[PDB]
Amino acid sequence: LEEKKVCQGTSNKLTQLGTFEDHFLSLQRMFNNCEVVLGNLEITYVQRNYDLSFLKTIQEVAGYVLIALNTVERIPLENLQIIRGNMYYENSYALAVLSNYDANKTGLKELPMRNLQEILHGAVRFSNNPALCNVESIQWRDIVSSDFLSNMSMDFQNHLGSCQKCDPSCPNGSCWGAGEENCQKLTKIICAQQCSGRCRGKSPSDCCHNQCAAGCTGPRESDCLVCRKFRDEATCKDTCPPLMLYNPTTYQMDVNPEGKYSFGATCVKKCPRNYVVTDHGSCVRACGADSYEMEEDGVRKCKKCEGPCRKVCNGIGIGEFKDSLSINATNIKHFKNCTSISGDLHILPVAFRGDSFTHTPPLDPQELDILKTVKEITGFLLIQAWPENRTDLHAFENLEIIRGRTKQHGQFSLAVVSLNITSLGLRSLKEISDGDVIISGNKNLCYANTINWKKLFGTSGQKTKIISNRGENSCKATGQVCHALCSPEGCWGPEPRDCVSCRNVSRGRECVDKCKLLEGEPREFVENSECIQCHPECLPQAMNITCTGRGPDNCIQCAHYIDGPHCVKTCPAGVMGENNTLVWKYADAGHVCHLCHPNCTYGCTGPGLEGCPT
Amino acid sequence: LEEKKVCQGTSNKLTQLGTFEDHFLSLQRMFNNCEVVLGNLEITYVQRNYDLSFLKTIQEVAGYVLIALNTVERIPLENLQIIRGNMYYENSYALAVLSNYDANKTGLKELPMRNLQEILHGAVRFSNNPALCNVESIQWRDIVSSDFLSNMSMDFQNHLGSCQKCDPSCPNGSCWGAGEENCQKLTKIICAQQCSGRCRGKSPSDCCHNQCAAGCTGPRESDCLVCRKFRDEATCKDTCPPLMLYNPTTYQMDVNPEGKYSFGATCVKKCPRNYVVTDHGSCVRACGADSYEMEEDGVRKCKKCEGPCRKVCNGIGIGEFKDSLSINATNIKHFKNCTSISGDLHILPVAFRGDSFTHTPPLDPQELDILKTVKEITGFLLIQAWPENRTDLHAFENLEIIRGRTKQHGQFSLAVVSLNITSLGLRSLKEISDGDVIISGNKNLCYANTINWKKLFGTSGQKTKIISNRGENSCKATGQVCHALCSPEGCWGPEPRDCVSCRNVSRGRECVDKCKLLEGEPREFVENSECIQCHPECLPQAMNITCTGRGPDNCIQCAHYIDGPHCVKTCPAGVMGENNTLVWKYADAGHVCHLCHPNCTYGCTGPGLEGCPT
Amino acid sequence: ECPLSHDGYCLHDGVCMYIEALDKYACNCVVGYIGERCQYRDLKWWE
Amino acid sequence: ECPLSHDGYCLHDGVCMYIEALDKYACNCVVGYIGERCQYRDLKWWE
Ligand SMILES: *C1O[C@H](CO)[C@@H](O)[C@H](O)[C@H]1NC(C)=O
Ligand SMILES: *[C@@H]1O[C@H](CO)[C@@H](O)[C@H](O)[C@H]1NC(C)=O
Ligand SMILES: *[C@@H]1O[C@H](CO)[C@@H](O)[C@H](O)[C@H]1NC(C)=O
Ligand SMILES: *[C@@H]1O[C@H](CO)[C@@H](O)[C@H](O)[C@H]1NC(C)=O
Ligand SMILES: *[C@@H]1O[C@H](CO)[C@@H](O)[C@H](O)[C@H]1NC(C)=O
Ligand SMILES: *[C@@H]1O[C@H](CO)[C@@H](O)[C@H](O)[C@H]1NC(C)=O
Ligand SMILES: *[C@@H]1O[C@H](CO)[C@@H](O)[C@H](O)[C@H]1NC(C)=O
Ligand SMILES: *[C@@H]1O[C@H](CO)[C@@H](O)[C@H](O)[C@H]1NC(C)=O
Ligand SMILES: *[C@@H]1O[C@H](CO)[C@@H](O)[C@H](O)[C@H]1NC(C)=O
Ligand SMILES: *[C@@H]1O[C@H](CO)[C@@H](O)[C@H](O)[C@H]1NC(C)=O
């Protein structure tokens, strides 16, 4: 009915964001109303008497759950059902409750995780939790997988004494907290020998579906609390329904009506327009090195390459650059001839002034021109720093498309902040497929808010955050507005080349007031509001127009000779013909080109033999 | 048992094969020891007495089961568990038991099909079985699927009475015969609500896996009696394990170790060499009209066409020709420009004398030349007839490969029988990927027993049935043997062009005795036992050889002039050069070509200006 | 004794026959020929 | 007061700090900058 509410999730680990209040107030803004944490759940540095009641709505965490350095007394992760474990903390655990004690040895006391029943991947770790009560009685053998049971390290202590006892109804005295409600619900180690996975009870008539996470309301595939793999609407599938099925009888391939595409951990009817559609029937973010991206056909697909594929450049934060957090002087070597960035771009201040922790030298601003070959970026573009001696985002003047298959914090596909630039300068940017645009903290930016960003967007609800850019009427005071040859569409700068659409016409990459018809140095013509030069062999017409096309075929009068339909500079004299016979011509009265006599081998200055003397 | 022994099955319907004994003998030869009937199970014209015990070993029939016109008293199809109904009898029934009575109104009496628990598709038809006992008490709502019970027409008439009753233990008096063993074993309408498919008992703890057909001996995926869809070794699968699985986390595709291929109704590790391997991970018999068959290092693969794909011609017996049983005057229009028959070819007698039953005029022998374009046949080639005036299988003069993805009777990929030809003439046949080759009953046919079939084959067990032809001693008597230039590999005829492999060398498509190196009009060179003519610009050496390659780069001496490495007929006079400057050259002493003076626009018959007079 | 319609319905010297029991027409193929119309030589047996 | 190794470890004027309770090192980022090293400006708020 109501698709769960999702939050990105933090990834700071033991890092503290500002003062205890700051850190808390941020923890609140990220997980307020959240029901599904796509990333990590990191509750740290929460002090006494703070209200963590908003953490009751979290039902599932895809990454890991880190709870460390908290003096707060109670953490209400009660409605938490499952921890996927897509990532581990310290490369071993999907759940880490560490050093939660006060100076007076009195910190976290109650952790009512009475609904945490499944932990798909990773192990568990409890340590230095003096006030922790009841959790010491949890038979984790049910919650955790047996594959990780070995890597599990945890020991409790009761240096508080004020811990209560488990309600008798609690199985083997196992309970997360007080009351009969906080009894550990076992759905793993209490099942018939013929139970594939989890169950509701002990009787074999209570076996849950093979694709159920914690527990189930019924035996069937659609009676799951949480899917174990994918989610096909009502039901939990192991594999999204193939677009095509093999026909054992005809030994061929048939189309599957029940077919769905694979988007993350869900099965959809179609892929987001900004993603890549495979023949398999799954939405991916990039093709193998065996393919490129062929559009048309409606969507973005993957077709193989005629020979050696173009060089694919993994963006910052993926593959070879999973750890590198910004384009630095070290990893910049691998961005030489890139026309497409299959990932993200991070231009951080740490790259310019060098980083002594990752042992990388400062970046030479002259080396950012390397990116002038980059035509499109699949992920997002984050620019938190940029050379001061430069007044323009020059390196990306050829940037045409930002797909936004991945966004900063999962929201922004284009972020230009805290810069000394005077003008964006993205005169090639034609589409921002998805994600939001944020251009703020820019003192000297005056052309930002003039662009109609809605035109550039491609998905529903794409927002645009352009604030704190001194000069709405201050810029106009310094005469830093769009040129006179810039259509109301806006402009990426002052120069006529910095226009989105033109007022009248254009000379390639620049707008102009009128094409060079009648006069001018180069004769031109008009089509689609563009000025194209007439073939050099077009006589400069001081009266009317000069030509009606690019080729010498559309001239009103030739400048020299005329070889039939075409306007030539000099009549042919050695052009290959039929039967390997050369071709020689001559100019008569009206400068018309006519074939010479077959005999004339050294050409001819007149018709027939009477034209080529000896 | 792991795998089962299979039989091709019959498809004669009500047709009688010879006399009652003949017929019975054919029935016996086919189904002896057979456990799985890939086609149909037609039991007809089985007389009194006659032992039908060999049927006891039949566990499953893919197509339909026909039991009609039998005076026999008992049919022991007891072990038959499932009828898939891949095909129907009379466009309705998967099982049709019809008019099984003697002239004295006493024939089929007992049909102990006590294990027949599943009928995947189709209805059931019982009619005119005066002696049939007990079967009238079976609840077919359990054996048949609800979708077809609307087409089920079956009434039993017991106007005799030699029948007994069902053991009191039998559920609702349902029995296929006497004894306690013939009690209908219901496993469909006795299942609890939680049951998805079949079941062992009524308790939910007995529910059969979703992918079970006739029932199970346990809940698990491996405890099935018969697979409902695909069979992956031990367990029954709905869909063979994909070669690659989608990664919900990285939004990309990962390789699947459990990955298998889809061959028929089984999950294999690799596809049969002769089959086509698709990207999906399934063995097929053809590529979509969107592509062709590109051999990829050792496995037939499907890619894509760079435009309008070559015409794919469906073979007789499939698609547009499912009804036609022989290429004839009518359907032959659709074989005009074929280079690859994607099916089978049936050249039958009826095609030549014309069929009145199918309203098709006699085939004009002159029109078999149409097939001279055919290059490969994905299936089998059957030729039971051929133009008498023709001595050769001319039409298939350029047939190179027979894949044998389908074989007649499931065994033979090439069958040339009962013909009148004197020579095969398949001088282009270089491969018979699979299937046996039978060439017999050809009165005056020679050379047949000379072919090294062991060279054309490409699969284990390929046999060759060549009997009752022209006597070998007679062939050598009338000097109708392999040409002297024919290697021991054999010969497709008397001519030097009919050799399988050449003795010495070969001129394109003909075997010879030696290349023309020292003499002969056109000079040639030897590489890979092939004779290729040197570039005409080579001077015929009356002493040593002439050249050592195709291009003029390998000439011992030029016949005319020489322009650097390459030997040319006449020095270049108009070739495009650098700076748009034309190129003119002149021959000197040793007929060597040199660049003229850049001034000479009309060329120069000599060096410098002193070579181009005026 | 089948109608003119099913005349030449059976190939390879087979004989058409009317099965009154089922009200159908079938073929009685000569030994060595299979198929509803006796159209196929039983290649897996004898020449 | 972190080791000379973690010198310049916390970006955007974040201060390094030793967590003796866990025997680890972490950053105390300034308001507005997130990440294990305060490397990202919290775009989804202001400026
Ligand atoms: C182009 O500029 C001229 C200036 O005279 C103006 O009259 C005309 O309307 C303009 N054309 C446009 C805006 O399409
Ligand atoms: C939490 O959610 C409630 C309900 O929408 C909202 O009113 C409140 O402002 C939120 N708290 C925040 C954003 O800190
Ligand atoms: C197991 O635990 C150890 C603890 O040191 C950890 O390093 C490792 O990553 C874990 N998993 C494996 C597969 O070793
Ligand atoms: C620079 O790149 C290297 C790897 O290419 C990485 O280890 C390092 O962290 C990066 N530095 C920054 C500041 O991103
Ligand atoms: C059928 O096959 C078996 C295989 O062993 C053989 O013994 C038997 O003689 C054959 N014929 C009959 C009628 O069973
Ligand atoms: C079975 O009995 C019949 C009685 O008509 C007899 O003709 C036939 O020869 C017997 N069959 C065999 C295989 O002995
Ligand atoms: C039902 O029977 C008719 C023949 O009377 C057949 O043509 C039709 O295909 C059958 N329907 C189904 C669903 O099998
Ligand atoms: C057999 O079917 C009848 C209904 O036709 C039902 O009443 C009866 O309970 C069934 N017998 C058993 C043993 O379940
Ligand atoms: C000949 O071909 C036509 C068209 O495919 C078909 O209708 C006819 O039945 C065929 N005749 C025979 C004898 O196969
Ligand atoms: C069979 O082949 C021979 C080859 O000599 C030919 O002469 C004869 O005409 C053919 N038979 C018939 C009936 O055409």
Ligand SMILES: *[C@@H]1O[C@H](CO)[C@@H](O)[C@H](O)[C@H]1NC(C)=O
């Ligand atoms: C074929 O070549 C071999 C080897 O050069 C030679 O000995 C033989 O005479 C040749 N055969 C004929 C028929 O000329």
Ligand SMILES: *[C@H]1O[C@H](CO)[C@@H](O)[C@H](O)[C@H]1NC(C)=O
């Ligand atoms: C077949 O022949 C026709 C007529 O010459 C020709 O147009 C066509 O291209 C040919 N087909 C192929 C596949 O070459």
